[PDB]
Amino acid sequence: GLVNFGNTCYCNSVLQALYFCRPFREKVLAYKSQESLLTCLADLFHSIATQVIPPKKFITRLRKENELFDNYMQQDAHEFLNYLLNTIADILQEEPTWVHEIFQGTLTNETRCLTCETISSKDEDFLDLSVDVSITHCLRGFSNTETLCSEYKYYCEECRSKQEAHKRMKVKKLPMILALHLKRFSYRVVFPLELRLFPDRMYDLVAVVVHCGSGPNRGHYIAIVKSHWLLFDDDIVEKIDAQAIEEFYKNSESGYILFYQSRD
Amino acid sequence: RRKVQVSYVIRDEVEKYNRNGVNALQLDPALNRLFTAGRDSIIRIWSVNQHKQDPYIASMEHHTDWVNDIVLCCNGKTLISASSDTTVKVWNAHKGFCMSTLRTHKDYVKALAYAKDKELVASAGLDRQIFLWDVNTLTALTASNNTVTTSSLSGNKDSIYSLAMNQLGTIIVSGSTEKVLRVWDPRTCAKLMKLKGHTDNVKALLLNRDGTQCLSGSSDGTIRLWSLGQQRCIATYRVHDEGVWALQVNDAFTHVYSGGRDRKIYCTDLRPDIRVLICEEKAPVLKMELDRSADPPPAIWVATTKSTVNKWTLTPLCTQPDQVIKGGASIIQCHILNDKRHILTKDTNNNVAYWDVLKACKVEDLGKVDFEDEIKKFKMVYVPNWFSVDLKTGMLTITLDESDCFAAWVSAKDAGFSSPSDPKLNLGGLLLQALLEYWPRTHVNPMVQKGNGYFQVPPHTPVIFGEAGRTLFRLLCRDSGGETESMLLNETVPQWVIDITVDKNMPKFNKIPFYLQPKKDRLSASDMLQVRKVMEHVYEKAVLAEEKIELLCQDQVLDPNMDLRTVKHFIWDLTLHYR
């Protein structure tokens, strides 16, 4: 259990959802084995498998390092996740990395120019995945194209200039733990416990993070995890049964961030 | 983003040959004249006689980016262009100069259109807007007073790539990235008909003299003939294998001529299984022009993404081109050598050349040496960035922005520039002084100086003022002084430039704080201070100090002609030890 210092569940719910990512919990305990935001998280993690907890050590450091949380108001868990993950992904690259091995995969984003109609193609990485509203399809196959226009034209090779174009993405390499995240600018968004993904590597749903309300910076986050299942909200720790998941698929309540560990 | 930059181009006074591909063609049968419109902001003129050795007549130079479409009117008494610089310009096709400029478009102006009878024209672009202009006003329009009755036309969902008006000036249709073909009446701006049927992008439109039926070619690879009379497609036509970007039509309006990413120049007839493969061009086909010299159209000029424009004549029909209008190489790769005043290019002919960016000229050609190994044969120094480079015109277009134009400070010494002592000098700063060298406001004497004082930019070098897409103004360095080109300066050159060139108000130095220690010490200095001068400080904490002090970052020994920012940029708040 982790105390709420007033609208700081954006953290408590990511931390306990990373804590049930098995590979990642392990590498972090071995890091305090041998004073930045990584020593603070270790110092924290080192003290949860020990024995309700105040994470004030960690908060203190987080919002003095990044001023996007240093106010009374809420924040967005995925900002935090991606921040927290990247901010480890380089804190290590200084002193590929153990984070990279775990969460990193790649995707192909294809860029068809409209003057040449060249299907140019290049790749890029990701620690997490942000996708918009059936889950099964979004990974296996492609995005749906989004144009590039006013101030957002594409630089072409053939064209040697910036001309209008079409982007869309496809997972090119799944990672071990697939950090996954869903839009906001809500629905009935369906998501399974086991997931058939591209050698068909399929994934057991291990951790998830949900959101109550109707806009992602004034409501409330919680956490669901893999038990040796459990429901975690800030002071409370009560068990729940696997069928109490479909409840979260006006304030018609959805979910937010899915973690799929591999059956590997 | 309505904030202003200053561009210039590195080029010979005259660029006889197209230094990048060609987007549009016009033909004057009256004077044997052909006008190409370049993907290098140049409309060049040509003579079509078998006579001419080099046909080249003149160059029409006023654009900044890809000229995309051109249209001759009043019998080629007046040409009208449209470009990626948002401007629709209006010329004198006979003499060869640019009367006026229309800045009403908000993005790349893609296609143009002409209804000869009513003498009205239309421009359209990626800003989804369609404009109408009555020609006899535009020919009476200037660079000082270009405010005219401009009719506007409304409806389009997305970015428009094609446009065409019937000969009578009664019908106009546009084709865009929505597969649909919106249609309007020109003399009223009123909408006529949608025209659903396609599955892709329509880069090409044509009409019959009455505009009763019309054609369309698309990036689905299909030519569709439409009966507007019945507001319906009446026939589809898959001759082509890739998207169709170019069309033309005979006087009878029966035989179609097309060409695409295919390169295949087929020609088919509505009477559609009698297809006539004319040729397979070496480059994707941008647009085409028929000869109406006499009906059974003799030959058809064809423009591609290749710098050279051929004429073809009327399993392949032809094999070799009947005409060759030659063309230049296109720079396609660049490199900035990190003294940040020199560049190495490499054109389509694999010619590597070394240029000077500050003086705005070529240092040399290096034949065809291995490019990526020539970039090595690589001084170990850091100067901050101050400019950026594009190759959209196939040429070195150089861009200066307020944000960091004034980053680069170097020593007169380290810039070659003589000094009977050694002063601190800002690169971009000298430059703006040197591009606006002939501008009489720049002729202020502080406590009559004209120029910067070390160098001059080549008088023929074009000076350009574009919003971070619209291009607001353009003149050559030498013509900075003409009264007509100078009321326009006071309208356009932005304050951030004025401050330096006109007021002669020089900008910030960059200091660098650093620690020094064999208790550390806090020092700061100009980011271009020679290491030598720091060892000179250690002694008191002049040549005698070369012998005595040794300076050391990250336990590496320091060259005492290095400036601090080199050190921090490479070896490495910065810290240095002594011995």
Swiss-Prot record, chain A:
It catalyses: Thiol-dependent hydrolysis of ester, thioester, amide, peptide and isopeptide bonds formed by the C-terminal Gly of ubiquitin (a 76-residue protein attached to proteins as an intracellular targeting signal). It is found in: Nucleus; Cytoplasm; Cell membrane. Keywords: Cell membrane, Cytoplasm, Hydrolase, Membrane, Metal-binding, Nucleus, Protease, Thiol protease, Ubl conjugation pathway, Zinc. The active site is at residues 9, 220. Changing residue 117 to K: Impaired binding to WDR48. The keyword Transferase does not apply. Belongs to the peptidase C19 family. USP12/USP46 subfamily. Deubiquitinating enzyme that plays various roles in the regulation of the immune response and inflammation. During TCR engagement and activation, translocates into the cytoplasm and deubiquitinates its substrates LAT and TRAT1 and prevents their lysosome-dependent degradation to stabilize the TCR signaling complex at the plasma membrane. Plays an essential role in the selective LPS-induced macrophage response through the activation of NF-kappa-B pathway. In addition, promotes that antiviral immune response through targeting DNA sensor IFI16 to inhibit its proteasome-dependent degradation. (Microbial infection) Forms a complex with Epstein-Barr virus protein EBNA3 which is an active deubiquitinase activity that may select specific substrates to promote B-lymphocyte transformation. This is Ubiquitin carboxyl-terminal hydrolase 12.
Curated annotation (Swiss-Prot), chain B:
Changing residue 261 to D: Strongly reduces interaction with USP12 or USP46 and abolishes stimulation of their enzyme activity. Changing residue 106 to A: In UAF1(11A); impaired DNA-binding. In UAF1(11A); does not affect ability to promote USP1-mediated deubiquitination of FANCD2 and stimulate RAD51-mediated homologous recombination, because of DNA-binding mediated by RAD51AP1. Changing residue 306 to A: In UAF1(11A); impaired DNA-binding. In UAF1(11A); does not affect ability to promote USP1-mediated deubiquitination of FANCD2 and stimulate RAD51-mediated homologous recombination, because of DNA-binding mediated by RAD51AP1. PROSITE patterns: WD_REPEATS_1, WD_REPEATS_2, WD_REPEATS_REGION. CDD domains: Ubl_WDR48, WD40. One of its GO terms (biological process) is positive regulation of epithelial cell proliferation. WD repeats lie at residues 17-56, 62-101, 104-143, 155-194, 197-236, 239-277, 280-314, 326-365. It is found in: Nucleus; Cytoplasm; Lysosome; Late endosome. This is WD repeat-containing protein 48. It comes from Homo sapiens (Human).
